[PDB]
């Protein structure tokens, strides 16, 4: 591969969502052996565009997303003199 020489994984012609990234567009995953492939960026899709057509939702769903953010970290301190000279 561009990233380097990959030994023990087999090369397949099927793209998949990435799992363990290697680099240069190549990802690896475990099937019943380890494979390497060009990663997929997303599902294939198309919008049914037309100059006189619109889509309008008729039923909605409600979902809850969990977002985690760090705020603080352990207040570690050390005095230089005791650390160095005991």
């Amino acid at each position: 591969t561009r990233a380097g020489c990959l030994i023990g994984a087999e090369h397949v012609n099927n793209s998949y969502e990435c799992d363990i990234p290697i680099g240069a567009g190549i990802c690896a995953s475990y099937q019943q052996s380890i494979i390497a492939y060009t990663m997929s960026l997303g599902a294939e899709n198309s919008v049914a565009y037309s100059n006189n057509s619109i889509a309008i939702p008729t039923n909605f769903t409600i979902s809850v997303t969990t977002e985690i953010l760090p705020v603080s970290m352990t207040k570690t301190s050390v005095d230089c003199t005791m650390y160095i000279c005991g």
Partner: protein, 203 residues
């Protein structure tokens, strides 16, 4: 791996601390890493050379720790700043910012406390079960061009209705949910329909 993001902070600091402590066992070229062995084994006029050698080594490792701790602190501060604005705009209000308070149309958020951090539960509205409809930018009516006041003009295949664009809910097109601007010879793609006048049934 749901809370890995807060765990990563704990792990980086735990490693930095443990590294700083194990580093004391390093001798940096001295005969021994332990000051008590060189001061008792080696005559003072030379022991001072090895003591100074250990100080340079240990002072450098401490300087390295502090420098990385300052950089890491900056990252945490930036996250804290984000959490602070996010709480004000997602919890104490309703942001209009896309994908700021999660994916979808933000309704409200409910914060939860976590060790060394905050977790936001974002409640969002998500469109679903859409259908294909035929549209027009305006309705032509006895020569005038009628534009939707708030929603869009759609057709179910036989009749024209006006709907809000975020939820299908068809209304008959009337003079109270449209407005007139210009005429039928200007708008591109204008269609011919009847606009209901709520007053006509009486007069």
């Amino acid at each position: 791996s749901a809370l890995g993001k807060l765990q990563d902070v704990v792990n980086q600091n735990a490693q930095a601390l443990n590294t700083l402590v194990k580093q004391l066992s390093s001798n940096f070229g001295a005969i021994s890493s332990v000051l008590n062995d060189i001061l008792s084994r080696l005559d003072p006029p030379e022991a001072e050379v090895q003591i100074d050698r250990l100080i340079t080594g240990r002072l450098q490792s401490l300087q390295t720790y502090v420098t990385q701790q300052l950089i890491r602190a900056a990252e945490i501060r930036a996250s804290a700043n984000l959490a602070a604005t996010k709480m004000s705009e997602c919890v104490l209000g309703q942001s209009k910012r896309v994908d700021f308070c999660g994916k979808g149309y933000h309704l409200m958020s409910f914060p939860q406390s976590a060790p060394h951090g905050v977790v936001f539960l974002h409640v969002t509205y998500v469109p679903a079960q859409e259908k294909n409809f035929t549209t027009a930018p305006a309705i032509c009516h006895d020569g005038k061009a009628h534009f939707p006041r708030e929603g869009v003009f759609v057709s179910n295949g036989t009749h024209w209705f006006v709907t809000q664009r975020n939820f299908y809910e068809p209304q008959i097109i009337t003079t109270d949910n449209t407005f007139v601007s210009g005429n039928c010879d200007v708008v591109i793609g204008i269609v011919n329909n009847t606009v209901y006048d709520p007053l006509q049934p009486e007069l």
